[PDB]
Amino acid sequence: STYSAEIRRTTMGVPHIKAGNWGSAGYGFGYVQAQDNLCTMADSFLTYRGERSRHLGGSAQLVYNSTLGRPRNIDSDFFHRHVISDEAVDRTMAAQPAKLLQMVEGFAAGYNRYVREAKAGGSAHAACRSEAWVQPITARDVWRRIYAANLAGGYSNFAEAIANAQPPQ
Amino acid sequence: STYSAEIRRTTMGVPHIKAGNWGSAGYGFGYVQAQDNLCTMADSFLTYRGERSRHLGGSAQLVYNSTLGRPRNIDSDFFHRHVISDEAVDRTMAAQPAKLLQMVEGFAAGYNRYVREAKAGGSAHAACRSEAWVQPITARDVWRRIYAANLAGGYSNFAEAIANAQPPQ
Amino acid sequence: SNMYGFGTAATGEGSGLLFGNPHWYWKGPDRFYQAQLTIDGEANVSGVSFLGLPVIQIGFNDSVAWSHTVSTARRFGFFQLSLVPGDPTSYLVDGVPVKMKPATITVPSRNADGSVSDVTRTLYHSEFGPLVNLAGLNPALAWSQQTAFAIRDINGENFRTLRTWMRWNQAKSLDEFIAIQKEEAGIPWVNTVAVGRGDAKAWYADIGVVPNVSPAQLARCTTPFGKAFAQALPNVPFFDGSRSECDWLTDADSVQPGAIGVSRMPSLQRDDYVGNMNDSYWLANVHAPLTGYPAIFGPAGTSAQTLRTRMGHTMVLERLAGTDGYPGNKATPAVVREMVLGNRVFSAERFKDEVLDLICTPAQWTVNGAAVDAAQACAVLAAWDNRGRKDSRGAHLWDEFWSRVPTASLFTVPFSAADPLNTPRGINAAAADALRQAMATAVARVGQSGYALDAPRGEVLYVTRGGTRLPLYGGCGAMGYFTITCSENDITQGGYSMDGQPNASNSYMQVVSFPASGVQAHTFLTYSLSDDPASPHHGDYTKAYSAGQWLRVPFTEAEITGNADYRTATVKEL
Amino acid sequence: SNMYGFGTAATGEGSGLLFGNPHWYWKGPDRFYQAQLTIDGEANVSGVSFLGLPVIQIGFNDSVAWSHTVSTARRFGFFQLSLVPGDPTSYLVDGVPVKMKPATITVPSRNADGSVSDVTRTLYHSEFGPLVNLAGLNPALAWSQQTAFAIRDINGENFRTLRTWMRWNQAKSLDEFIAIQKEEAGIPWVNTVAVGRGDAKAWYADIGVVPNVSPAQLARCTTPFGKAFAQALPNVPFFDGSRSECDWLTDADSVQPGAIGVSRMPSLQRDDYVGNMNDSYWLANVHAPLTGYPAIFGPAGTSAQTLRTRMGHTMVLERLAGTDGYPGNKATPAVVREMVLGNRVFSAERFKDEVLDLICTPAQWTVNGAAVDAAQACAVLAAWDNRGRKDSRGAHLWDEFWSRVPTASLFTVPFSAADPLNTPRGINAAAADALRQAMATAVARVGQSGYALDAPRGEVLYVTRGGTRLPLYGGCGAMGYFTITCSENDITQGGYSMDGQPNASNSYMQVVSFPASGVQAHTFLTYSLSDDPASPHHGDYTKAYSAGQWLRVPFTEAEITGNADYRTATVKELE
Ligand SMILES: *C(=O)CCCCCCCCC
Ligand SMILES: *C(=O)CCCCCCCCC
């Protein structure tokens, strides 16, 4: 009925998540990751959802370098929407065991938890905590990122070219 | 041919060239410009001649921002060779008063003079003095730079586009 | 770029006064170089040239003084080519097939491994100009088996530019200066303001080489594709290359085929003032607008002026009205030297108080569902006097704010041709949430820069010489600065550094007047003469600019030889 | 990326040792984040995950430890489509028309004026994968009336990756680890090395998802256009999509259609060691080279190895021979922790002397008709010991030099499959002039930088935390570094700063063993856990890395609770 996770931190702030099941493990993991890297992650989910241009402009480049390189937002948005389609997400999620489905749903909930905390106040993440693109995500959003990680050896390297594949006029 | 120029420098290194004719004025002017700004200038003559790629690589961008923007060397090279053709230079020169042609001849000679001094030794222009693109220029090379300055309102803005304008496959 | 041309009515003296203020590159071959040319019995000119140009483009002599600013006038045009079926390297002109002029070019290119390999491309010209690939503009304008595209720049056949500057260098009167400009009509892409010794009026002109198309041509010769982007390239002729009637026209007093005659190109003479800050000729003088001239020169009362244009004219009017906080009501050399380095910000002066009154009560906000503390931001900006001086505190916050303010229906009082310096205005209360969104981001940026909200501008805006950071003043035109010091560097990456390749900024500056004793010029070259860090002339001029200490540049032989740093040496070769 | 897997014969201990050393991003969503997951009666795993990923991708449990490196094996391919006359959005397969699947996508885009406008494009998929624009690659590859191009990535249909890592997280032996890897065959684009408790042999494998093509197809399916890209993209199948016989094959033991069968994918177990430095599977173990596997995995006896690969394997041989200057001749946890941070530079060790002998006398040169004084440059390099440590002086000069050395006909002794670690070698005397050119340029650049030629590397190579420059060590693998600290910042722009977005560099580092007492692991997270500059965990790890002080990371509950900085908190909410 509930997610519950104990978060132990040691030297260098290394988090040790203890949970009773997989869903709660994802909850704790999602929390600590956001707690430490909210701005990067928030920006990242814009990418996979293909929602960069609406916030940051179409002609601007990816802020962060990645397996995707740093194409223009507009091309990146098209790529992700085209290749990481609702269908691709469906097929990905349909092949997963229940524990991983639960774990990702927990991950999202945990990530969303911190978003609430950052919005409410705190001196942490001053750089992005009050931006519109710092917002709740869904499990499918996480699955999109997971699918994206797979494409590093293929599609990712042809993002702009895939986004601009058009027939003769 | 027999250029002679008196160079007075005042506060801030401001030069005041004194010559008996236009050729010798160009000699003094070209010398002082190179004396103060060799690296930049030497680099610029690569551009207008379309010889950037040979030295600096074709994929690399223009080092300096200008009216030309900062396209890829390879595209810039094609642009300049195509638009600033020998014919373009020929007609620019054909319509010049004697004194100007003489002034440009001198300017080239004055520039080349300092080039020899820089190569010979010294600690001035340590960043480029030993590079291959630091080399003597011709009067025509200066006319290339002169003509290139006119295009800032037009062609210059479509350098890459002009260099990649090829008939249908 | 800015320039003023003050007449005797404004100076209260025998001659006018010229302020040249090009906002140009701080690095590269296009950057300016200050020098004086004295050619026995031909010329004695002083000013500035692009590295690689042997004549003075901006400066003064014993009789005249001038400067330039980029013009709104379009200097190029497009020609939609109707290809010949089968051979896409030929186009139809009034029916008859015309061959494209080819040229196979091999460019040696050094590979990443250190080897040099040849790359060859075959490119083409038309009778109009070079073929251009507009596919990047719109995939539909690809060079097809039916349609291609060429570009034409009127300056491509203009071989009179240097000859004009050369003649100006030698000119003996403002009248000769003007006659030269009309005679040569070779100025390529800039406006011109000139002042003269003993001449009562100052001179403005957008007299150069400009494409000539008739209203009839605009209607008939504009192609389908052309219409589809006359809002992306306003006033750029996008004509049909099939019809010869669609070729640029030549008037009776045209110096160059395809260019506008000298009679229908804008100019004005005033005893009060002339000025331009990169807007159209329209407001050369605000009291006497210019209208009627062709559209290709730009809007003349249908478009709002930039903030910088409004700031420039506003400063002149307040000077002559004697209400700018400076002595007297005349544009004297000493006062112009200070006024132009005033660091006034039009956005702040006009709209700041309105924005704070709207959004800073309260100052604890909820933005994007998030609690935001804006108390300090509101306090700093209220204490700030809307100037971008070195001691000014919070100017950088405004910069980061204003550049993120959505302009759509931000003003309640729209543009009025009858009041173009004070319109548009009126911060719409409906934009409060949007303003808060922008301000929250701005505070977040400054926070990530390591600079306090109340950091003095001299610490955020700077230039490094010899390991020491010289404090700077000024800002970007978009914010409504007149004194331009515009970094390309994001504030989060070590502040507004000017050590990289900044945006167009104060470069060569000259305040030139013609007292009885003779021409007197005060100048700056912001980045200094030498690009070599080991040179004594790399940062000597820059230090002075930082401290705001103008240089009285020697002109007369006696002044040159009498200078405290006089050095002479002669150079010869067969 | 580097990884070593040592067996008991190299450890002299009852278990093997695992060194993980991915060279990855220091910023962005793909950067690693270190954490431990304890899931009652399911898993107790510790290591690293991409930000956004819920399972450990590189780490260890009580029974196994593993790392990854990018594989040379191609994971994608191109299909040239023959279009139906009249319809550029239909293609032909064995004479049968097939319509491309269209998708009209609308993307909201903010304008510079703060307004949001819609940008709409229609994009297509084929049965092979998304259409792709190869025009920029070569304008002859433009999508026309006749032909178009699609790209196929084998991972587009791979949904077994997370499930692979999750099961590894749970694995209770290396045998299980291996079995899992073979069941799932879901690793997308990386090699794997692993070591297990109570197992004498270490494990290497490039077992994953790889396109399956036959030598026949490679000869009779590659299209004219394709044969032109055999140089730029070697081993990338560029096939004719108009023939079904040119589709990717499925083997009897394929887990995924179009992918190679498990049994035709390379692997190896060894008592001494296994290793990869981003080259092919070939030299997993130098003493036992792998051969005969599909060409799409990369060369195996035909191509020279990178300098980093040569440095990597050399380091291991010299360790086990006891000639590397470290105590003993075994790969002990303590020794490995040091050797991997040795900052040895292969290019210098092997070629410097030859270079200096060829150009440094006379030391007064004429370069491009200009007088060049290279006496100081030569003296500094001669006094340098070919290491990129913090106190090393001149290492940056070598960097600026080597990166400018033309590689064409640079070596006189060609590559030999017999001696892959010591070939190619022999600096060509004919390259004398080019070398002086490169050295002259190198000296100039260092001059522009404001750094002395003999400045200690720790002042040139650095990362900023708390307003102070922490000295760093290592370099870029292109110069034969093993310890990778590779800046993207040009030296003239304030040195080799690591404060921006550096190139692939040391990130998460683990040395994991399995003594009788239980898993023991020492770790680094070079850039630290948090991207928030205000965070206490933004620079704490970094400071230790600068000081070369590994962290013994707690694993057991007693170790966690006993940690000096132990704090616990419970987070709960309704599901
Ligand atoms: C400002 O807008 C630019 C003015 C100076 C540009 C170049 C001046 C000389 C004309 C070619
Ligand atoms: C070096 O190349 C490091 C390997 C890349 C990251 C490994 C993480 C697992 C994702 C497949």
Side-chain angles (χ1 to χ4, degrees):
Chain A
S1 64
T2 77
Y3 299 120
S4 185
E6 201 183 67
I7 299 173
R8 301 80 68 73
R9 289 205 183 241
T10 59
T11 312
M12 304 308 190
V14 175
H16 315 253
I17 317 297
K18 177 157 187 170
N21 56 56
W22 285 84
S24 295
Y27 188 73
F29 203 9
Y31 183 68
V32 289
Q33 273 189 42
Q35 181 174 52
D36 287 319
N37 296 290
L38 170 60
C39 293
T40 300
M41 283 178 89
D43 173 286
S44 73
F45 282 118
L46 282 196
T47 308
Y48 311 123
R49 291 175 59 241
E51 288 278 306
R52 296 196 61 78
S53 308
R54 133 188 269 116
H55 290 105
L56 316 170
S59 61
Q61 283 179 295
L62 272 275
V63 174
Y64 301 105
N65 195 8
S66 68
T67 52
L68 181 77
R70 298 188 54 190
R72 297 186 303 133
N73 287 341
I74 192 61
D75 294 310
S76 175
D77 284 351
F78 274 111
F79 166 66
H80 286 104
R81 289 171 180 238
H82 188 225
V83 177
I84 312 188
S85 60
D86 286 300
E87 187 187 63
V89 173
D90 287 357
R91 316 213 309 120
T92 296
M93 277 181 80
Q96 306 308 308
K99 290 176 190 288
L100 273 184
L101 290 176
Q102 295 164 4
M103 176 185 221
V104 168
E105 290 193 64
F107 194 83
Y111 171 101
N112 289 354
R113 179 197 176 110
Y114 189 72
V115 168
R116 289 198 296 285
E117 293 180 3
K119 284 182 180 293
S123 59
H125 305 297
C128 70
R129 60 172 289 286
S130 65
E131 296 295 310
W133 44 265
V134 175
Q135 57 182 238
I137 66 178
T138 65
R140 289 174 69 73
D141 287 348
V142 177
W143 280 116
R144 282 179 176 106
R145 183 270 176 296
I146 292 158
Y147 187 73
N150 271 50
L151 305 183
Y155 296 142
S156 294
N157 301 297
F158 291 102
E160 185 181 304
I162 293 171
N164 285 294
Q166 286 272 248
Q169 279 55 58
Chain B
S1 301
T2 170
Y3 304 118
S4 184
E6 183 178 358
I7 297 163
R8 297 86 55 97
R9 288 202 186 242
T10 63
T11 313
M12 299 311 193
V14 176
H16 316 252
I17 310 300
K18 182 165 182 170
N21 57 54
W22 284 83
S24 290
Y27 188 72
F29 200 14
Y31 177 73
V32 290
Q33 276 188 45
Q35 174 168 56
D36 288 315
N37 296 288
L38 174 58
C39 297
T40 297
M41 280 178 80
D43 175 292
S44 74
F45 283 117
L46 284 205
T47 309
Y48 307 122
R49 294 179 54 234
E51 291 286 300
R52 292 195 70 71
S53 303
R54 182 197 295 289
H55 294 290
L56 301 185
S59 61
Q61 281 181 289
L62 273 278
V63 168
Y64 297 110
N65 194 11
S66 60
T67 46
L68 172 80
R70 299 191 52 198
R72 293 183 304 131
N73 287 346
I74 189 63
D75 298 308
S76 177
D77 285 354
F78 275 115
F79 170 74
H80 286 102
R81 284 172 165 245
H82 184 56
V83 180
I84 309 189
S85 64
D86 278 296
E87 179 189 305
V89 171
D90 279 353
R91 282 198 298 167
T92 302
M93 285 181 85
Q96 297 306 304
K99 284 141 178 286
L100 272 192
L101 292 178
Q102 295 172 3
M103 180 183 220
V104 174
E105 282 284 304
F107 187 100
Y111 176 100
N112 294 351
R113 183 198 175 108
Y114 186 70
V115 166
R116 293 189 307 255
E117 293 176 356
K119 285 185 178 300
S123 59
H125 306 297
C128 68
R129 60 172 291 285
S130 63
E131 297 293 348
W133 35 278
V134 171
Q135 55 180 57
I137 58 175
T138 67
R140 292 175 67 71
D141 292 311
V142 170
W143 279 115
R144 291 185 167 88
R145 183 270 172 301
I146 291 156
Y147 184 81
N150 276 4
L151 310 183
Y155 295 133
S156 295
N157 300 296
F158 303 79
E160 179 180 356
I162 290 173
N164 293 293
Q166 287 197 113
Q169 288 309 297
Chain C
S1 307
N2 310 317
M3 43 183 198
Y4 290 141
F6 292 109
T8 48
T11 63
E13 287 284 60
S15 295
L17 181 155
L18 186 297
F19 174 60
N21 181 13
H23 307 134
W24 209 231
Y25 305 82
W26 275 39
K27 291 186 176 180
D30 280 359
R31 91 180 204 165
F32 285 122
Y33 185 84
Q34 190 181 6
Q36 176 174 356
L37 299 181
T38 308
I39 311 156
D40 205 314
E42 309 229 10
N44 187 11
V45 56
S46 170
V48 127
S49 309
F50 298 171
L51 290 178
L53 288 192
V55 290
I56 300 302
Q57 292 163 289
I58 297 177
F60 62 98
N61 59 28
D62 58 356
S63 300
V64 295
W66 79 99
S67 183
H68 291 300
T69 65
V70 175
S71 182
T72 52
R74 324 308 300 245
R75 306 294 174 137
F76 68 106
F78 289 111
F79 282 101
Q80 178 166 350
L81 295 186
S82 297
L83 296 198
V84 172
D87 182 62
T89 37
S90 301
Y91 56 107
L92 290 166
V93 167
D94 289 353
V96 65
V98 192
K99 245 175 139 49
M100 269 178 206
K101 180 192 177 74
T104 302
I105 304 175
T106 296
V107 180
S109 180
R110 185 180 183 182
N111 297 301
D113 65 299
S115 54
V116 173
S117 65
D118 288 2
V119 9
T120 92
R121 302 212 290 232
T122 310
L123 302 183
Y124 297 79
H125 268 106
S126 63
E127 69 176 62
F128 302 108
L131 276 290
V132 59
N133 178 350
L134 295 185
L137 211 83
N138 192 312
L141 282 92
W143 185 341
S144 56
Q145 309 79 197
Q146 329 95 205
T147 298
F149 296 103
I151 178 168
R152 176 180 175 190
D153 176 356
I154 197 72
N155 284 296
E157 301 284 300
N158 176 9
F159 313 122
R160 306 185 302 292
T161 308
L162 262 236
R163 180 161 88 258
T164 302
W165 282 315
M166 150 172 204
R167 294 187 64 188
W168 280 355
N169 291 184
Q170 300 177 110
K172 318 297 309 196
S173 68
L174 176 60
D175 292 310
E176 187 185 357
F177 183 116
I178 295 170
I180 295 165
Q181 186 168 2
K182 289 178 177 171
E183 199 182 305
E184 295 290 358
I187 295 306
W189 40 262
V190 284
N191 296 285
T192 309
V193 159
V195 160
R197 173 175 61 172
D199 195 301
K201 298 195 204 291
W203 167 252
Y204 164 96
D206 192 355
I207 292 171
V209 74
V210 185
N212 179 353
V213 293
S214 64
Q217 271 176 348
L218 281 335
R220 273 200 281 300
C221 279
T222 303
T223 71
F225 288 133
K227 314 273 171 191
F229 43 10
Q231 32 178 56
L233 267 336
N235 291 306
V236 173
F238 201 116
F239 284 3
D240 183 1
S242 300
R243 314 202 292 289
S244 63
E245 62 181 300
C246 292
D247 298 1
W248 303 351
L249 296 179
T250 312
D251 301 357
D253 57 355
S254 295
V255 185
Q256 194 184 308
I260 299 180
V262 175
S263 58
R264 299 186 305 114
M265 275 186 317
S267 60
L268 167 73
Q269 318 183 48
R270 297 283 297 181
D271 45 4
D272 51 346
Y273 92 92
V274 283
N276 186 259
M277 293 81 224
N278 294 124
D279 269 312
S280 80
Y281 62 97
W282 179 42
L283 261 36
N285 181 297
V286 80
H287 302 307
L290 287 172
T291 53
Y293 300 81
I296 194 170
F297 273 108
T302 53
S303 295
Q305 305 297 289
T306 64
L307 292 190
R308 176 166 50 105
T309 292
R310 298 160 65 178
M311 182 79 249
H313 288 295
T314 285
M315 280 158 66
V316 174
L317 298 203
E318 291 183 359
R319 178 83 291 283
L320 295 179
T323 59
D324 58 2
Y326 288 117
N329 65 297
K330 295 289 156 47
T332 66
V335 159
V336 167
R337 269 180 273 130
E338 296 192 302
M339 111 176 302
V340 300
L341 293 192
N343 297 312
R344 289 177 62 177
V345 193
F346 193 91
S347 57
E349 280 182 4
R350 294 282 168 117
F351 310 128
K352 189 202 68 187
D353 280 347
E354 290 176 59
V355 173
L356 304 180
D357 289 356
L358 216 92
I359 74 173
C360 292
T361 65
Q364 305 302 304
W365 304 338
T366 297
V367 192
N368 305 307
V372 176
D373 183 0
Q376 196 199 348
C378 290
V380 167
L381 289 177
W384 174 56
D385 59 2
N386 304 319
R387 286 185 305 179
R389 323 196 318 174
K390 287 171 309 197
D391 57 352
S392 301
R393 310 176 81 80
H396 56 293
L397 208 220
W398 183 251
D399 289 349
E400 292 301 313
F401 168 63
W402 189 251
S403 58
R404 280 172 180 103
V405 164
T407 63
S409 56
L410 169 71
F411 296 114
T412 53
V413 180
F415 175 58
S416 170
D419 195 3
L421 299 187
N422 304 297
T423 73
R425 68 170 181 281
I427 292 304
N428 188 358
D433 280 357
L435 296 178
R436 272 183 289 250
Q437 286 181 299
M439 178 64 81
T441 300
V443 171
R445 303 298 295 181
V446 175
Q448 258 36 59
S449 72
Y451 289 109
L453 299 201
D454 61 353
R457 192 179 182 66
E459 293 179 359
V460 179
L461 183 67
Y462 63 83
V463 60
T464 309
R465 283 296 184 290
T468 75
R469 279 186 191 176
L470 301 179
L472 285 191
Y473 42 95
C476 302
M479 264 53 99
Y481 279 81
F482 187 79
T483 312
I484 302 310
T485 307
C486 196
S487 177
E488 88 288 11
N489 194 62
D490 186 290
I491 191 175
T492 61
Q493 265 88 58
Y496 298 137
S497 178
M498 295 286 305
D499 299 308
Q501 299 197 65
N503 300 302
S505 298
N506 286 359
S507 48
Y508 177 64
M509 289 172 91
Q510 69 173 0
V511 174
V512 183
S513 63
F514 300 78
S517 49
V519 244
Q520 296 191 357
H522 297 248
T523 67
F524 279 125
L525 199 65
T526 55
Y527 43 78
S528 302
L529 279 164
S530 188
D531 66 353
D532 179 3
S535 173
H537 307 309
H538 177 64
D540 53 358
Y541 226 139
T542 302
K543 260 97 183 307
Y545 180 64
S546 180
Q549 280 163 353
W550 292 76
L551 180 76
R552 170 67 186 293
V553 65
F555 185 69
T556 64
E557 287 302 299
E559 284 165 357
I560 296 170
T561 65
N563 173 279
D565 303 291
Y566 173 49
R567 298 270 101 120
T568 191
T570 84
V571 286
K572 325 182 171 74
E573 84 170 56
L574 263 84
Chain D
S1 303
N2 309 309
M3 46 188 187
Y4 291 139
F6 297 103
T8 52
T11 61
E13 299 150 308
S15 70
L17 173 153
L18 186 294
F19 171 58
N21 186 197
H23 310 135
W24 209 232
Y25 304 97
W26 275 38
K27 291 185 174 175
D30 283 356
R31 67 183 259 170
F32 288 125
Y33 177 100
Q34 186 181 2
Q36 176 173 356
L37 298 179
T38 308
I39 315 171
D40 296 355
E42 291 290 303
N44 195 13
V45 59
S46 175
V48 127
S49 307
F50 294 172
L51 281 170
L53 292 198
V55 304
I56 301 300
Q57 304 170 248
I58 295 181
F60 59 96
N61 55 43
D62 62 357
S63 304
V64 300
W66 77 100
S67 188
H68 292 305
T69 61
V70 165
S71 164
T72 53
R74 300 303 195 173
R75 308 291 172 163
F76 72 104
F78 289 107
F79 288 80
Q80 188 177 311
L81 302 182
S82 298
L83 299 192
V84 173
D87 188 3
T89 58
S90 293
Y91 55 107
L92 285 162
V93 180
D94 288 349
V96 45
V98 185
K99 194 78 201 195
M100 281 174 207
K101 191 179 182 185
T104 304
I105 304 167
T106 293
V107 174
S109 183
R110 158 175 288 245
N111 302 294
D113 68 299
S115 60
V116 175
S117 71
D118 282 358
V119 180
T120 299
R121 308 208 286 237
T122 294
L123 302 181
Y124 302 74
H125 287 252
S126 64
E127 63 187 63
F128 302 113
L131 272 293
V132 59
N133 182 352
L134 295 183
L137 218 84
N138 179 352
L141 272 44
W143 185 344
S144 62
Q145 315 281 173
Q146 287 81 56
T147 79
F149 298 98
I151 176 174
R152 183 177 172 183
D153 179 351
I154 198 70
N155 291 299
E157 317 271 351
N158 176 10
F159 311 124
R160 313 177 298 283
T161 62
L162 259 226
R163 205 253 276 28
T164 300
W165 281 315
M166 166 198 188
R167 293 181 68 195
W168 281 353
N169 292 188
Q170 290 182 109
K172 279 292 158 63
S173 66
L174 174 61
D175 276 357
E176 181 177 0
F177 182 105
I178 296 168
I180 291 171
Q181 189 170 8
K182 286 180 172 178
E183 278 180 58
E184 300 297 351
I187 301 312
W189 37 264
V190 282
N191 303 291
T192 305
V193 162
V195 168
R197 195 193 55 236
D199 198 301
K201 279 201 264 283
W203 163 262
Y204 160 96
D206 194 358
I207 290 169
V209 195
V210 175
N212 181 359
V213 305
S214 66
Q217 294 180 304
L218 285 168
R220 70 98 169 298
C221 283
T222 306
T223 64
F225 287 144
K227 271 96 69 172
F229 312 130
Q231 171 273 125
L233 276 187
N235 301 312
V236 170
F238 201 116
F239 285 177
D240 178 357
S242 64
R243 342 208 323 248
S244 59
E245 73 209 65
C246 294
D247 264 298
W248 296 355
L249 298 190
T250 306
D251 289 350
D253 58 351
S254 294
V255 182
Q256 187 184 309
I260 304 175
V262 170
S263 62
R264 294 196 307 120
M265 279 183 308
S267 59
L268 176 68
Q269 286 175 286
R270 294 279 303 182
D271 288 306
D272 48 355
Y273 91 99
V274 283
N276 181 257
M277 281 71 52
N278 284 133
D279 266 302
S280 79
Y281 60 103
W282 179 39
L283 256 54
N285 181 297
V286 141
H287 302 301
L290 290 169
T291 60
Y293 291 79
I296 192 167
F297 275 104
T302 161
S303 180
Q305 306 294 282
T306 68
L307 294 190
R308 180 157 60 77
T309 292
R310 293 163 70 173
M311 183 78 243
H313 285 293
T314 297
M315 279 159 75
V316 161
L317 291 199
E318 290 178 353
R319 173 76 300 253
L320 297 188
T323 64
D324 63 357
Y326 290 117
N329 65 359
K330 293 287 155 48
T332 68
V335 165
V336 166
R337 274 184 276 128
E338 280 192 2
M339 63 171 332
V340 294
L341 300 190
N343 301 302
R344 287 175 60 181
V345 191
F346 196 80
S347 55
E349 285 189 0
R350 294 294 177 106
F351 306 131
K352 183 190 66 179
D353 283 354
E354 286 182 61
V355 167
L356 296 185
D357 288 358
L358 204 72
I359 69 165
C360 277
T361 315
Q364 307 298 306
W365 305 340
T366 288
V367 184
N368 303 301
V372 176
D373 185 1
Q376 192 187 303
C378 286
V380 168
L381 287 179
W384 176 52
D385 69 354
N386 305 317
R387 300 151 70 188
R389 294 154 42 107
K390 289 176 288 162
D391 59 1
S392 298
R393 301 169 86 80
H396 58 293
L397 205 211
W398 182 252
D399 288 346
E400 293 303 313
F401 166 68
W402 188 252
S403 58
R404 292 193 166 72
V405 158
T407 61
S409 299
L410 174 63
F411 296 114
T412 58
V413 178
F415 167 69
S416 167
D419 200 2
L421 301 198
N422 306 300
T423 61
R425 76 168 176 281
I427 301 298
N428 187 353
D433 285 351
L435 293 184
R436 279 183 295 251
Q437 280 182 290
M439 182 61 75
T441 300
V443 164
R445 304 295 297 182
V446 176
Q448 268 185 109
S449 71
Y451 287 113
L453 289 181
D454 64 355
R457 190 182 185 69
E459 292 184 358
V460 180
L461 214 207
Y462 65 82
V463 57
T464 310
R465 287 291 187 289
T468 58
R469 291 184 177 179
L470 300 179
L472 283 184
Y473 48 77
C476 301
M479 275 68 123
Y481 271 95
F482 184 81
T483 317
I484 307 305
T485 315
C486 197
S487 179
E488 87 289 6
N489 192 62
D490 190 288
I491 189 169
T492 59
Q493 299 303 123
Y496 301 140
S497 169
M498 294 288 299
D499 298 309
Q501 295 196 69
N503 302 301
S505 293
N506 286 0
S507 53
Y508 179 64
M509 299 184 81
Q510 65 175 6
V511 177
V512 191
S513 63
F514 302 77
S517 54
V519 237
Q520 283 191 358
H522 293 249
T523 60
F524 276 124
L525 196 58
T526 58
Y527 44 74
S528 303
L529 273 160
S530 183
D531 70 344
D532 179 3
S535 176
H537 304 309
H538 174 70
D540 52 3
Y541 228 139
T542 304
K543 220 169 69 71
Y545 182 65
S546 176
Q549 285 167 8
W550 290 78
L551 178 83
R552 175 58 188 295
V553 63
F555 184 69
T556 64
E557 290 299 297
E559 285 169 356
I560 293 175
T561 54
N563 179 254
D565 302 298
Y566 172 60
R567 319 221 85 103
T568 191
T570 113
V571 280
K572 66 190 35 266
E573 92 174 15
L574 257 308
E575 157 179 0

